[PDB]
Design a protein around this ligand. Structure first.
Ligand SMILES: CNC(=O)C[C@@H](C)Nc1ncnc2[nH]c3cc(Br)ccc3c12
Length: 167
């Protein structure tokens, strides 16, 4: 039993809700919140900009030190950093950005990072400003993640479409 509330169950291990991931993290304080990161950990907009804003820019300060030490992530890769006031940990995961020409096949590799964590609160990778089809992202999530994932979808119209079209 966990504290996630109001989710629709899609499969044995995947759950979904129309919710602002920032507000959801603040309420649940999950062990892991997933950020929709880029390779530079520049949290300017989309989910990343919103999560970082909620940390009062502490996420960005920590991220800049991480990059200065380690260099950029790989597309499809991840790193674990602090969750600040939102969660114990933040798993920064880089899905391919279609608006940069990146290989959509890398979306499966991106979701594989979730399997290193027993339970996660997450957005749909490569959705939103990353330009991928969210219906496809949900399909890859369900077919790749084996651990327990609670998906927050900000847009109500999109949430209803994802549920209604789910096979
Ligand atoms: C239409 N874009 C998506 O669907 C992409 C998806 C990854 N974005 C989000 N997903 C879940 N919760 C979220 N809260 C937010 C608050 C702010 Br401001 C900006 C974005 C999000 C956000």
């Amino acid at each position: 039993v966990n504290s996630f509330s109001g989710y629709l169950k899609l499969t044995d291990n995947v759950y979904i809700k129309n919710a602002d991931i920032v507000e959801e993290a603040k309420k649940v304080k999950p062990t892991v919140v997933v950020n929709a990161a880029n390779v530079y950990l520049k949290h300017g907009g989309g989910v990343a900009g919103a999560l970082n804003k909620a940390t009062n820019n502490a996420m960005q300060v920590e991220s800049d030190d991480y990059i200065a030490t380690n260099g950029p992530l790989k597309v499809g890769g991840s790193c674990v950093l602090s969750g600040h006031n939102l969660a114990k940990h933040c798993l920064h995961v880089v899905g391919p950005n279609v608006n940069k020409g990146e290989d959509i096949q890398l979306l499966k590799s991106a979701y594989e990072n979730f399997n290193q964590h027993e339970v996660l609160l997450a957005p749909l990778l490569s959705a939103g400003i990353f330009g991928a089809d969210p219906i496809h992202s949900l399909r890859v999530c369900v077919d790749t993640v084996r651990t327990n994932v609670y998906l927050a979808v900000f847009d109500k119209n999109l949430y209803d479409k994802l549920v209604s079209s789910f096979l």
